[PDB]
Amino acid sequence: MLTLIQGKKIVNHLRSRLAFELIKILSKNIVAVGSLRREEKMLNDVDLLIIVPEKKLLKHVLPNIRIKGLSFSVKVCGERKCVLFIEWEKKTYQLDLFTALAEEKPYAIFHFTGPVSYLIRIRAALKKKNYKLNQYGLFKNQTLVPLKITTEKELIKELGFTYRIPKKRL
Amino acid sequence: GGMLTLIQGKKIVNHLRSRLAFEYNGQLIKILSKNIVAVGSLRREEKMLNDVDLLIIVPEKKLLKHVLPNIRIKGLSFSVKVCGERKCVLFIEWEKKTYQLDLFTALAEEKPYAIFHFTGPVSYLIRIRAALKKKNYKLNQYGLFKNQTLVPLKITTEKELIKELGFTYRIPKKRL
DNA sequence: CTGGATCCA
DNA sequence: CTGGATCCA
Ligand SMILES: Nc1nc2c(ncn2[C@H]2C[C@H](O)[C@@H](CO[P@@](=O)([SeH])OP(=O)(O)OP(=O)(O)O)O2)c(=O)[nH]1
Ligand SMILES: Nc1nc2c(ncn2[C@H]2C[C@H](O)[C@@H](CO[P@@](=O)([SeH])OP(=O)(O)OP(=O)(O)O)O2)c(=O)[nH]1
Ligand SMILES: [Mn+2]
Ligand SMILES: [Mn+2]
Ligand SMILES: [Mn+2]
Ligand SMILES: [Mn+2]
């Protein structure tokens, strides 16, 4: 376990130091998610989402992730979930990395921000409008629903739900 | 697990044909041997097998929640590695030796598709499926599908399925 | 080629 | 609710 402040600190050390095979990952594209983003006093792990600017790269980003400076082991890894165990200040913490292509970023932030309870209510509701929501996009009947949106707040509003901040979602 | 000869596998099966059963809210229910079908390397009559693969035909959709989850082999000592409604992998003690026993299930209307799938070998299944992929079809242990939709075929048996799909019917021992 | 059990996210 | 990684069938 870690405190919110520990998580926040850890993130910052990482914001500069992410990269992949030798290509750096802009901090602009790293987004803290999960219990950290919701600003819980206590966290179990740090959950980071990474925005990939093009579809080809997913085969390479998490599979060839590079944290310049840090000691760590990889539990499991694929193109969309890589779970790392980092040695931080003589202690071991879990670091979960996820990816989203550019056009997915809001859908993903919304999904990975959580909490789960909130996601279930939201998702349950959308089934009866024939819609399907997830981390990738919004879909009607096995088809992508193109929304003229950039951010999470815009996604949440456009979907037709009340925009609440992460700390006040459950 | 450990290796067995075709004859060992065949023998094992027979001991099992009469001894399979299941609980279903506390009624202890036997599984007809008529509904047990040897599959995998045994059915292909390879000289040597790695495990015995048995397919079980379930006559009613409700029962799947109960059959493999509450499987009963009357007489045998065994441990369960993993188990769900469709794959249950068992390790049986047979004659002071441990062998793997993989149980699968198919509903009635699935039986040919399942037999075909589980009969294998894998290499053969890939060629076959690749070809059907190119006509915009999808083959499964469950059925045949075009564009996420079931393709109803006038068929009963595996040979009829294989033929109807539009492939040359070869017997299990000569598939690869 | 295609999917199942497990155990996560 | 909805889907991912792994190790299998
Ligand atoms: N749809 C869906 N999404 C899920 C689920 N579990 C986690 N997630 C997402 C939402 C979470 O904010 C995010 C991180 O998951 P996690 O297991 Se790490 O829980 P989290 O909310 O961060 O709290 P903490 O890590 O336990 O402190 O992943 C889930 O079961 N269903
Ligand atoms: N489509 C598809 N089917 C597969 C696959 N692996 C096993 N199967 C099916 C076909 C096999 O006949 C059956 C059992 O597989 P298994 O790994 Se246990 O080997 P099997 O072919 O029985 O011979 P043996 O067990 O090695 O002696 O399950 C697969 O990857 N794709
Ligand atoms: Mn977390
Ligand atoms: Mn996590
Ligand atoms: Mn086998
Ligand atoms: Mn097997």
How many Cβ atoms from other residues are within 10 Å of residue A97's Cβ?
23
In angstroms, what is the span from residue B105 Cα to ligand 6's centroid? Answer: 13
Question: What is the fold of B109-174?
Answer: Beta Polymerase; domain 3 (3.30.210)
Q: Is A4 in the pocket of ligand 1 (CB under 6 A)?
A: no
E strand segments, A23-147: 23-24, 30-33, 42-43, 45-52, 65-67, 71-77, 81-87, 92-101, 131-133, 138-140
Cα separation, B35 vs A56, in Å, equals: 48
Sign of CA dihedral B110, B142, B32, B55: positive
Resolution in angstrom units: 3.0
Whether A156 and A163 have beta carbons less than 8 Å apart is answered as yes
Question: What is the fold of A103-168?
Answer: Beta Polymerase; domain 3 (3.30.210)
Whether B79 and B73 have beta carbons less than 8 Å apart is answered as no
Q: Which two tokens stand for residue A23?
A: 């290509």
Q: Is B110 in the pocket of ligand 2 (CB under 6 A)?
A: no
Site to substitute for ligand 2 among B53, B81, B116, most atoms within 8 A of C-beta: B53
Dihedrals phi, psi of B138, to nearest 5 degrees? -140, 120
In angstroms, what is the span from residue A48 Cα to ligand 4's centroid? Answer: 9
Q: Where do the domains of chain A lie?
A: 2-101, 103-168
Coil, strand or helix at B114? helix
Question: What is the fold of B4-108?
Answer: Beta Polymerase; domain 2 (3.30.460)
Torsion of CA A32, A37, A39, A44, to 10 degrees: -60
Amino acid identity of residue B72, one-letter, is R
Q: Which two tokens stand for residue B153?
A: 């075929």
CATH superfamily of the A2-101 domain: Beta Polymerase, domain 2 (3.30.460.10)
Q: Cα–chain-centroid distance for residue B143?
A: 14
The verdict on whether omega for the bond into residue A115 sits within 30 degrees of 0, i.e. cis, is: yes
Cα separation, A77 vs A96, in Å, equals: 10
Q: Is B49 in the pocket of ligand 2 (CB under 6 A)?
A: yes
Dihedrals phi, psi of B92, to nearest 5 degrees? -100, 140
Which residue's CA is the closest to the ligand 2 atom numbered 26?
B50
Beta-ladder partners of B4: B49
Q: End-to-end CA distance of chain B: give it in Å, rounded.
A: 24
Chain B window 111-130: residues with CB closer than 7 Å to nucleic chain C are 122, 125-126, 129-130
For chain A, helix (H) and strand (E) counts, in that order, are 5, 12
Q: Which two tokens stand for residue A68?
A: 């310049």
Asked whether strand C has any atom less than 7 Å from the CB of A83, the reply is: yes
Q: Is A19 in the pocket of ligand 1 (CB under 6 A)?
A: no
Torsion of CA B126, B130, B136, B141, to 10 degrees: -10
How many Cβ atoms from other residues are within 10 Å of residue A150's Cβ?
10
Q: Cα–chain-centroid distance for residue B1?
A: 19
The angle formed by the CA atoms of residues A128, A129 and A135, to the nearest 5 degrees, is: 95
**Nearest DNA or RNA nucleotide to B142 (CA to C1'):** C3
Query: What letters, b where the CB count within 10 A reaches 16 and e where it falls short, cover A21-51?
Result: eeeebeeebbbbbbbbbbebeebebbbbbbb
Residues contacting residue A39 through CB under 8 Å, at least 6 positions apart: A4, A166, A167
Site to substitute for ligand 1 among A11, A31, A85, A116, most atoms within 8 A of C-beta: A116
Whether B95 and B102 have beta carbons less than 8 Å apart is answered as no
C-alpha distance from residue B64 to each of A79, B26, B69, B78, B87 (Å): 34, 15, 8, 21, 11
Whether A169 and A163 have beta carbons less than 8 Å apart is answered as no
Q: Cα–chain-centroid distance for residue B140?
A: 13
**Nearest DNA or RNA nucleotide to B125 (CA to C1'):** C1
Q: Is B172 in the pocket of ligand 2 (CB under 6 A)?
A: no
- Interhelix angle A152-159/A105-113, nearest 10 degrees: 80
